[PDB]
Amino acid sequence: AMADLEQKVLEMEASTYDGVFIWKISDFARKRQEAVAGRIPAIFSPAFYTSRYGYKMCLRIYLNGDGTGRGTHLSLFFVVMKGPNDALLRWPFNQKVTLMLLDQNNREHVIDAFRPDVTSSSFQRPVNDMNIASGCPLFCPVSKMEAKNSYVRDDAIFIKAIVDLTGL
Amino acid sequence: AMADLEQKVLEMEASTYDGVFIWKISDFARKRQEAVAGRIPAIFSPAFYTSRYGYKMCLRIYLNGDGTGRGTHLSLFFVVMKGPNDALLRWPFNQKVTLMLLDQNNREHVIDAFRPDVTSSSFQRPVNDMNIASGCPLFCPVSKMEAKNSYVRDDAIFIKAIVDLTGL
Amino acid sequence: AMADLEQKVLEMEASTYDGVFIWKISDFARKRQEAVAGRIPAIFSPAFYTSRYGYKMCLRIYLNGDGTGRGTHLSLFFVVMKGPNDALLRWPFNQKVTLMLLDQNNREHVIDAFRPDVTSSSFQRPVNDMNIASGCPLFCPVSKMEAKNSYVRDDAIFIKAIVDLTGL
Amino acid sequence: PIQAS
Amino acid sequence: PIQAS
Secondary structure (H helix, E strand, O other): HHHHHHHHHHHHHHHHOOEEEEEEOOOOHHHHHHHHOOOOOOEEOOOEEEOHHHHHHEEEOOOOOOOHOOOOOOEEEEEEEEEOOOHHOOOOOOOOEEEEEEOOOOOOEEEEEOOOOOOOHHHHOOOOOOOOOEEEEEEEEHHHHHHHOOEEEEEEEEEEEOHHHHHH | HHHHHHHHHHHHHHOOOOOEEEEEOOOOOHHHHEEEEHOOOEEOOEEEOOOOOOEEEEEEEEEOOOHOOOOOEEEEEEEEEEOHHHOOOOOOOOOOOOEEEOOOOOOOOEEEEEOOOOHHHHHHOOOOEEEOOOOEEEEEEHHHHHOOOOOOOOEEEEEEEEEEOOOO | HHHHHHHHHHEEEEEHOEEEEEEEEOHHHHHHHHHHHOOOOOOEOOOOOOOOOOOOOEEEEEEEHHHHEEEEEEEEEEEEEEEOOOOHHOOOOOOOEEEEEEOOOOOEEEEEEEEOOOOOOHOOOOOOOEEEEEEEEEEEEHHHOOOOOOOOOOOOEEEEEOOOOOOO | EEEEO | EOOOO
């Protein structure tokens, strides 16, 4: 009831419709310690879209890493979600995805990118609320976060996603 | 009360501001039955706009037909609504309107375009919440959306409207 | 919580993300009398943005004037507010601002504009919720608000702001 | 620009 | 892209 509508409002506050998304993660130190302790291994971002009626997507982050990144890296993954208009879209999802951790001095961003593996279940038309997340287990070393740095400033970080819209 | 703000959130979720609107009608079979049985002959779409501060508009559908199409056709209508910025706009409303029923196999969409008759009360500056509707009583034969029709897929249909922006 | 949710929903209803904002001030005669009587000297507009993740801004109006305009002019000011992404933006704020009172016969708008004084605290990175407002105390003589005039119509006026986006 | 008083 | 575990 109340909580459902609250989630709807926050989702709508965060949504974008041009395939460009900036995720501000505040209270970074506590959330990272929550990951280190295993209490909250991962966090989902709000959803965003490639166009007004396009693909629905979100991000998933592990502040203390997943898989090969466990214990040493921030791991960051892309998620194709079940969207209201999926029946109108091309499948499999086949857009290049660029993911960054922003330097708040703007000098040296962390940036990674990939093209979808169209054979992977991660990029098929969703049958559940989300497909399996796919992306970069070795996205960013935890040491870059812990030492003197400009990625974490005022206890927040910014993650930016750019979904290329070629062909859409 | 709560229902008021639930309605407000739903309208905001569906609003567009570039004259292009896609209306997904789910639970198609149930709503068709409600229309055939006379309980809910018509449904209004959420509102959309020609621009951020432009005309306010919605659609009205009769899943079992209205007027000449009653009982034989889907009937689809366009509605000029009282908008918050009407005092800044030109009246009568004079933009081309294109309405479509989307084939979900990407086959022949049903498409009708019209230009407003500027002498009609449907297009004068609204005095009530909604002007009188205008559109196509014979938009699509009911028999054309049946088993293996491809307009209905997974119990949903998609209606698209495009309002031309020339001169705005 | 419903009060807080209502506020968020109203903010989102009014937000724009391209530096263009139109502020409809309804109940004009009552609000102007409230200003004349000193009970509510000033009104703040909803917030708007230069881009999806850009500067957060609002307007502040004195319907019976402030400073040199007090009692003889509408005074209209621009406010830089603390936005969620300020750490990503360039400071000081350096964008030209155009402010207008719209003629609802669209013949003679009131318009003023300024370049920010980049040495002023009004344009530094905000530490409080808003910076000190700055703008035009002599924006519009109150005589232009008379009934024979076409700025007030059906007990409402329209204010427009255009934040130039050069270099963003 | 002039600041609001 | 590598899938999450």
